[PDB]
Amino acid sequence: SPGIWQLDCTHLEGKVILVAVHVASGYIEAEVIPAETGQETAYFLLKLAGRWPVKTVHTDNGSNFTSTTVKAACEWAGIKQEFGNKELKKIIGQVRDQAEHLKTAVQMAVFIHNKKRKGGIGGYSAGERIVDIIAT
Amino acid sequence: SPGIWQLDCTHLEGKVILVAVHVASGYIEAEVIPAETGQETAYFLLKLAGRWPVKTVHTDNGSNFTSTTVKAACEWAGIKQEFGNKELKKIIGQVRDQAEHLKTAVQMAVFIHNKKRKGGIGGYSAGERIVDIIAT
Ligand SMILES: O=C(O)Cc1coc2ccc(-c3cccc(F)c3)cc12
Ligand SMILES: O=C(O)Cc1coc2ccc(-c3cccc(F)c3)cc12
């Protein structure tokens, strides 16, 4: 569907990388947080939902169902939380020393994941795909 | 054009709100930063450019032309920096006490600006407009 998203954790240099995937397109948004609190998760969902149609967020774990802020962010924004890739880390390792902060390398790797052509040569990007789907 | 953006400062509770406007659509993205450094500006541009087509960023002032990080972010991302609205603050004042941090109210106000129908009743939203333009 157009507004389906998958939310995930990944970890690096002892920080948490939050990743949202638009399932139909492959487009990603990521943010690095100091700590894995639900407060930070809730602000990232709020930003996401103001930038895109965010109807349903899937999570693999239980941590998102026990944060009152997240619950209140989803209600205000109209997000359905429901229970039930890592080329990213390859690219972060490529750029990691051409900028100091990990967060920057993450966002450089998000840039590349979203903009490249899905697989190399020919097709659309994750970022083209998401706009198309939503246009319809 | 599709990738034209306007970048602006606004201020509230003694913090800086960075605002990017997609000129053709009216869509906005905003971030609150501790300090007005170019480092923070450069990370916000990097995130923006990984989420959307960002070809040209207009600024009203000179502060962006004197930050080496911003200059290096634009070059890496392919952004042309060139030299040459505030319903936002109205909405931040409406929500400001239904959440603690200013940043949240900003993002709630961004959500509303982007999602509402441009003027009330009938039309498209800023957020629909931007996707349409880019689809084409
Ligand atoms: O490096 C850091 O941690 C500081 C920093 C904060 O926001 C940024 C956005 C972009 C770049 C950058 C620098 C050089 C080449 C390049 F392609 C990108 C750096 C930063
Ligand atoms: O409040 C704060 O500063 C903490 C906070 C950080 O990220 C957030 C994202 C969303 C909400 C929230 C809370 C209640 C109603 C609502 F519509 C939204 C709060 C926060």
Side-chain angles (χ1 to χ4, degrees), chain B residues 75-116:
Chain B
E75 172 176 320
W76 185 96
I79 298 170
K80 175 92 156 296
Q81 200 140 226
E82 272 174 50
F83 177 81
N85 230 257
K86 257 43 162 170
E87 177 210 14
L88 207 57
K89 279 210 196 139
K90 182 230 196 197
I91 309 167
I92 290 159
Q94 300 184 264
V95 301
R96 187 50 194 89
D97 57 11
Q98 86 209 38
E100 255 62 3
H101 303 91
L102 172 76
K103 64 196 296 199
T104 305
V106 170
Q107 291 315 330
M108 292 180 200
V110 166
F111 180 111
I112 287 163
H113 169 85
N114 283 337
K115 297 287 187 213
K116 79 194 150 85

Short mmCIF file of all heavy atoms in Angstrom, two decimals, chain B residues 75-116:
data_model
loop_
_atom_site.label_atom_id
_atom_site.label_comp_id
_atom_site.label_asym_id
_atom_site.label_seq_id
_atom_site.Cartn_x
_atom_site.Cartn_y
_atom_site.Cartn_z
N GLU B 75 28.40 20.53 -2.37
CA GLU B 75 29.18 19.98 -3.47
C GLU B 75 28.97 18.47 -3.57
O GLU B 75 28.67 17.95 -4.64
CB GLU B 75 30.68 20.29 -3.29
CG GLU B 75 31.55 19.55 -4.32
CD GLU B 75 33.05 19.90 -4.24
OE1 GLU B 75 33.37 21.09 -4.06
OE2 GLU B 75 33.91 19.00 -4.39
N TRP B 76 29.07 17.77 -2.43
CA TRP B 76 28.85 16.33 -2.40
C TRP B 76 27.46 15.93 -2.89
O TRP B 76 27.32 14.85 -3.47
CB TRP B 76 29.02 15.84 -0.97
CG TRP B 76 28.93 14.36 -0.82
CD1 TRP B 76 29.98 13.50 -0.79
CD2 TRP B 76 27.76 13.58 -0.61
NE1 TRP B 76 29.54 12.23 -0.58
CE2 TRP B 76 28.18 12.24 -0.48
CE3 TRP B 76 26.41 13.86 -0.54
CZ2 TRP B 76 27.28 11.19 -0.29
CZ3 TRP B 76 25.52 12.82 -0.35
CH2 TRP B 76 25.97 11.51 -0.23
N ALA B 77 26.43 16.74 -2.60
CA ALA B 77 25.03 16.42 -2.90
C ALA B 77 24.60 17.01 -4.22
O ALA B 77 23.62 16.54 -4.79
CB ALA B 77 24.09 16.93 -1.79
N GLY B 78 25.34 18.00 -4.71
CA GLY B 78 25.02 18.54 -6.01
C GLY B 78 24.05 19.67 -5.89
O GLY B 78 23.20 19.89 -6.75
N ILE B 79 24.20 20.41 -4.81
CA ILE B 79 23.31 21.52 -4.54
C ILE B 79 23.97 22.81 -4.99
O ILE B 79 25.12 23.09 -4.66
CB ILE B 79 22.94 21.57 -3.05
CG1 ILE B 79 22.20 20.29 -2.70
CG2 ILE B 79 22.07 22.76 -2.79
CD1 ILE B 79 21.97 20.06 -1.22
N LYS B 80 23.22 23.61 -5.76
CA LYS B 80 23.57 24.98 -6.08
C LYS B 80 22.97 25.92 -5.04
O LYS B 80 21.75 26.13 -5.01
CB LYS B 80 23.07 25.30 -7.49
CG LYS B 80 23.25 26.72 -7.96
CD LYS B 80 24.57 26.92 -8.70
CE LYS B 80 24.49 28.12 -9.64
NZ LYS B 80 23.49 27.93 -10.73
N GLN B 81 23.83 26.52 -4.23
CA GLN B 81 23.45 27.65 -3.39
C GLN B 81 23.42 28.97 -4.15
O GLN B 81 24.43 29.39 -4.71
CB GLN B 81 24.45 27.80 -2.25
CG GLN B 81 23.91 28.58 -1.12
CD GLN B 81 24.33 27.99 0.18
OE1 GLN B 81 23.51 27.81 1.11
NE2 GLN B 81 25.61 27.65 0.27
N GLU B 82 22.30 29.67 -4.07
CA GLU B 82 22.17 30.97 -4.71
C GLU B 82 21.63 32.02 -3.75
O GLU B 82 20.81 31.74 -2.88
CB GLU B 82 21.22 30.94 -5.89
CG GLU B 82 21.86 30.59 -7.18
CD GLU B 82 20.82 30.44 -8.27
OE1 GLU B 82 19.97 31.36 -8.42
OE2 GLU B 82 20.83 29.39 -8.96
N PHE B 83 22.09 33.25 -3.95
CA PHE B 83 21.71 34.34 -3.08
C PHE B 83 20.52 35.04 -3.70
O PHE B 83 20.45 35.19 -4.92
CB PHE B 83 22.87 35.32 -2.89
CG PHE B 83 22.50 36.50 -2.07
CD1 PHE B 83 22.48 36.41 -0.68
CD2 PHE B 83 22.13 37.71 -2.67
CE1 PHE B 83 22.13 37.51 0.09
CE2 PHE B 83 21.79 38.82 -1.89
CZ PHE B 83 21.77 38.71 -0.51
N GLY B 84 19.56 35.42 -2.87
CA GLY B 84 18.30 35.97 -3.35
C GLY B 84 17.15 34.99 -3.48
O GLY B 84 16.11 35.17 -2.83
N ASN B 85 5.46 30.21 4.72
CA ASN B 85 5.65 31.52 5.35
C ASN B 85 5.33 31.38 6.83
O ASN B 85 5.43 30.28 7.37
CB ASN B 85 4.79 32.62 4.71
CG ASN B 85 5.62 33.89 4.32
OD1 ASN B 85 5.55 34.91 5.03
ND2 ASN B 85 6.38 33.82 3.21
N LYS B 86 4.96 32.45 7.52
CA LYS B 86 4.92 32.39 8.97
C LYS B 86 3.51 32.21 9.53
O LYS B 86 3.21 32.68 10.64
CB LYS B 86 5.60 33.61 9.58
CG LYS B 86 6.98 33.26 10.09
CD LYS B 86 7.72 32.36 9.11
CE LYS B 86 9.22 32.37 9.40
NZ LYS B 86 9.95 31.33 8.61
N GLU B 87 2.63 31.54 8.78
CA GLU B 87 1.54 30.78 9.38
C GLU B 87 2.09 29.80 10.40
O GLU B 87 1.44 29.48 11.40
CB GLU B 87 0.77 30.03 8.29
CG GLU B 87 -0.38 29.12 8.77
CD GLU B 87 -0.61 27.91 7.84
OE1 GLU B 87 0.26 27.62 6.98
OE2 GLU B 87 -1.65 27.23 7.98
N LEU B 88 3.29 29.31 10.13
CA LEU B 88 3.99 28.40 11.02
C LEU B 88 3.95 28.80 12.48
O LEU B 88 3.68 27.97 13.36
CB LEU B 88 5.44 28.33 10.51
CG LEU B 88 6.25 27.07 10.78
CD1 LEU B 88 5.57 25.81 10.21
CD2 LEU B 88 7.67 27.29 10.21
N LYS B 89 4.24 30.06 12.78
CA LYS B 89 4.35 30.45 14.18
C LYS B 89 2.98 30.49 14.85
O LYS B 89 2.85 30.18 16.05
CB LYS B 89 5.03 31.81 14.31
CG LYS B 89 6.55 31.75 14.22
CD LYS B 89 7.15 32.88 15.04
CE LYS B 89 8.60 33.12 14.68
NZ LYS B 89 8.91 34.58 14.64
N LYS B 90 1.95 30.86 14.09
CA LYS B 90 0.58 30.79 14.58
C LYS B 90 0.26 29.39 15.10
O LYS B 90 -0.22 29.22 16.23
CB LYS B 90 -0.37 31.20 13.46
CG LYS B 90 -1.85 31.23 13.83
CD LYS B 90 -2.72 30.48 12.82
CE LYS B 90 -4.20 30.84 12.99
NZ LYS B 90 -5.11 29.86 12.34
N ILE B 91 0.57 28.36 14.30
CA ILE B 91 0.25 26.99 14.68
C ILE B 91 1.14 26.50 15.82
O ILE B 91 0.70 25.73 16.68
CB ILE B 91 0.36 26.08 13.45
CG1 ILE B 91 -0.44 26.66 12.27
CG2 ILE B 91 -0.12 24.69 13.77
CD1 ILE B 91 -0.14 25.99 10.89
N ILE B 92 2.40 26.92 15.87
CA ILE B 92 3.23 26.49 16.98
C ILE B 92 2.64 26.98 18.29
O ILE B 92 2.74 26.31 19.33
CB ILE B 92 4.67 26.98 16.84
CG1 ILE B 92 5.40 26.28 15.71
CG2 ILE B 92 5.41 26.73 18.10
CD1 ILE B 92 6.57 27.06 15.25
N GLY B 93 2.04 28.18 18.28
CA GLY B 93 1.46 28.70 19.50
C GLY B 93 0.21 27.97 19.92
O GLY B 93 -0.14 27.98 21.10
N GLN B 94 -0.46 27.32 18.96
CA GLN B 94 -1.66 26.56 19.26
C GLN B 94 -1.36 25.25 19.99
O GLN B 94 -2.14 24.82 20.85
CB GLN B 94 -2.39 26.25 17.96
CG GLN B 94 -2.82 27.43 17.15
CD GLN B 94 -3.61 26.98 15.95
OE1 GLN B 94 -3.06 26.83 14.85
NE2 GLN B 94 -4.90 26.72 16.15
N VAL B 95 -0.25 24.60 19.63
CA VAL B 95 0.08 23.29 20.17
C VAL B 95 1.13 23.34 21.26
O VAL B 95 1.45 22.31 21.86
CB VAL B 95 0.55 22.36 19.03
CG1 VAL B 95 -0.54 22.22 17.99
CG2 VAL B 95 1.85 22.90 18.39
N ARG B 96 1.69 24.52 21.54
CA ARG B 96 2.96 24.60 22.25
C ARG B 96 2.93 23.92 23.61
O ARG B 96 3.98 23.46 24.09
CB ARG B 96 3.36 26.07 22.39
CG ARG B 96 4.74 26.28 22.96
CD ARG B 96 5.78 25.45 22.25
NE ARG B 96 7.02 25.41 23.02
CZ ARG B 96 7.30 24.52 23.96
NH1 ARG B 96 6.44 23.56 24.26
NH2 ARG B 96 8.46 24.59 24.59
N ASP B 97 1.78 23.86 24.25
CA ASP B 97 1.69 23.30 25.59
C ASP B 97 1.11 21.89 25.60
O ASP B 97 1.09 21.26 26.67
CB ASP B 97 0.85 24.21 26.48
CG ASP B 97 -0.53 24.45 25.93
OD1 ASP B 97 -0.90 23.73 24.97
OD2 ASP B 97 -1.23 25.34 26.44
N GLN B 98 0.65 21.37 24.46
CA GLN B 98 0.31 19.95 24.40
C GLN B 98 1.52 19.09 24.04
O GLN B 98 1.36 17.95 23.58
CB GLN B 98 -0.86 19.72 23.44
CG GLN B 98 -0.59 19.53 21.98
CD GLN B 98 -1.77 20.02 21.14
OE1 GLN B 98 -2.39 21.03 21.49
NE2 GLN B 98 -2.11 19.32 20.02
N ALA B 99 2.73 19.60 24.27
CA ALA B 99 3.95 18.82 24.29
C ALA B 99 5.02 19.70 24.90
O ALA B 99 4.98 20.92 24.78
CB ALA B 99 4.38 18.34 22.90
N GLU B 100 6.00 19.06 25.53
CA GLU B 100 7.00 19.81 26.27
C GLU B 100 7.96 20.54 25.34
O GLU B 100 8.07 21.77 25.38
CB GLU B 100 7.71 18.86 27.22
CG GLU B 100 7.29 19.01 28.71
CD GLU B 100 5.80 18.70 29.02
OE1 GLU B 100 5.02 18.30 28.11
OE2 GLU B 100 5.41 18.88 30.20
N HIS B 101 8.68 19.80 24.49
CA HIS B 101 9.76 20.39 23.70
C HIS B 101 9.26 21.22 22.54
O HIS B 101 8.34 20.81 21.84
CB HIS B 101 10.69 19.30 23.17
CG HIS B 101 11.26 18.46 24.26
ND1 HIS B 101 10.65 17.30 24.69
CD2 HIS B 101 12.33 18.65 25.06
CE1 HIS B 101 11.35 16.79 25.69
NE2 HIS B 101 12.37 17.59 25.93
N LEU B 102 9.87 22.38 22.33
CA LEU B 102 9.52 23.22 21.19
C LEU B 102 9.63 22.44 19.88
O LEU B 102 8.77 22.56 19.00
CB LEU B 102 10.43 24.45 21.16
CG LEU B 102 10.29 25.32 19.92
CD1 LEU B 102 9.03 26.13 20.00
CD2 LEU B 102 11.48 26.21 19.73
N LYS B 103 10.68 21.63 19.75
CA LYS B 103 10.90 20.90 18.51
C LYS B 103 9.66 20.13 18.08
O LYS B 103 9.32 20.10 16.90
CB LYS B 103 12.09 19.96 18.68
CG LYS B 103 11.85 18.91 19.70
CD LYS B 103 13.15 18.30 20.10
CE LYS B 103 13.76 17.58 18.91
NZ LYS B 103 14.80 16.58 19.29
N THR B 104 8.96 19.53 19.03
CA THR B 104 7.78 18.75 18.75
C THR B 104 6.66 19.62 18.20
O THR B 104 6.00 19.27 17.23
CB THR B 104 7.36 18.05 20.04
OG1 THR B 104 8.48 17.29 20.53
CG2 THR B 104 6.14 17.19 19.82
N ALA B 105 6.39 20.74 18.86
CA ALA B 105 5.40 21.67 18.37
C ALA B 105 5.75 22.16 16.96
O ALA B 105 4.88 22.22 16.09
CB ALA B 105 5.30 22.83 19.36
N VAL B 106 7.02 22.47 16.70
CA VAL B 106 7.44 22.82 15.34
C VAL B 106 7.03 21.74 14.36
O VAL B 106 6.39 22.03 13.34
CB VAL B 106 8.97 23.05 15.30
CG1 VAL B 106 9.46 23.19 13.87
CG2 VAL B 106 9.32 24.27 16.08
N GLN B 107 7.38 20.49 14.65
CA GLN B 107 7.06 19.39 13.75
C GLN B 107 5.56 19.11 13.68
O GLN B 107 5.10 18.62 12.64
CB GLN B 107 7.77 18.11 14.16
CG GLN B 107 9.25 18.18 13.94
CD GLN B 107 9.64 18.76 12.62
OE1 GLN B 107 8.92 18.63 11.61
NE2 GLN B 107 10.77 19.44 12.60
N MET B 108 4.80 19.38 14.75
CA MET B 108 3.35 19.30 14.63
C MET B 108 2.85 20.39 13.68
O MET B 108 2.00 20.13 12.84
CB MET B 108 2.68 19.46 16.00
CG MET B 108 2.90 18.31 17.03
SD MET B 108 2.03 18.70 18.58
CE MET B 108 2.85 17.65 19.76
N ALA B 109 3.43 21.59 13.77
CA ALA B 109 3.03 22.68 12.90
C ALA B 109 3.46 22.44 11.46
O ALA B 109 2.78 22.87 10.54
CB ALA B 109 3.62 24.00 13.39
N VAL B 110 4.59 21.76 11.25
CA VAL B 110 4.99 21.39 9.90
C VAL B 110 3.99 20.39 9.34
O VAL B 110 3.55 20.51 8.19
CB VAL B 110 6.42 20.82 9.90
CG1 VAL B 110 6.72 20.12 8.59
CG2 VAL B 110 7.39 21.88 10.19
N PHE B 111 3.67 19.36 10.14
CA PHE B 111 2.65 18.38 9.77
C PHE B 111 1.38 19.07 9.26
O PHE B 111 0.88 18.78 8.18
CB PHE B 111 2.38 17.48 11.00
CG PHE B 111 1.34 16.40 10.78
CD1 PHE B 111 1.71 15.08 10.75
CD2 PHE B 111 -0.01 16.72 10.66
CE1 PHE B 111 0.78 14.10 10.60
CE2 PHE B 111 -0.93 15.76 10.48
CZ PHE B 111 -0.55 14.45 10.46
N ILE B 112 0.90 20.04 10.02
CA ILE B 112 -0.37 20.66 9.69
C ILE B 112 -0.25 21.52 8.45
O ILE B 112 -1.10 21.46 7.56
CB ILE B 112 -0.88 21.43 10.91
CG1 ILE B 112 -1.35 20.40 11.92
CG2 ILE B 112 -1.91 22.43 10.46
CD1 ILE B 112 -1.48 20.93 13.21
N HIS B 113 0.84 22.30 8.36
CA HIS B 113 1.04 23.12 7.16
C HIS B 113 1.07 22.27 5.91
O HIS B 113 0.45 22.62 4.90
CB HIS B 113 2.33 23.92 7.23
CG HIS B 113 2.67 24.55 5.92
ND1 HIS B 113 2.14 25.76 5.53
CD2 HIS B 113 3.38 24.08 4.86
CE1 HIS B 113 2.56 26.04 4.31
NE2 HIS B 113 3.30 25.03 3.88
N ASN B 114 1.76 21.13 5.96
CA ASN B 114 1.94 20.29 4.77
C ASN B 114 0.70 19.50 4.39
O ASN B 114 0.53 19.16 3.21
CB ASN B 114 3.09 19.33 5.00
CG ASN B 114 4.46 20.01 4.85
OD1 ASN B 114 4.57 21.04 4.20
ND2 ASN B 114 5.48 19.44 5.44
N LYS B 115 -0.13 19.15 5.36
CA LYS B 115 -1.21 18.21 5.15
C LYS B 115 -2.54 18.86 4.86
O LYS B 115 -3.37 18.25 4.21
CB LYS B 115 -1.42 17.33 6.39
CG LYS B 115 -0.29 16.46 6.78
CD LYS B 115 -0.11 15.29 5.85
CE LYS B 115 0.94 14.37 6.41
NZ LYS B 115 1.73 13.70 5.32
N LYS B 116 -2.76 20.06 5.40
CA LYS B 116 -4.01 20.79 5.24
C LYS B 116 -4.26 21.05 3.76
O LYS B 116 -3.36 20.91 2.91
CB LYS B 116 -3.97 22.14 5.97
CG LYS B 116 -3.20 23.18 5.15
CD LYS B 116 -2.83 24.43 5.96
CE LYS B 116 -1.50 25.08 5.42
NZ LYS B 116 -1.60 26.03 4.26
#
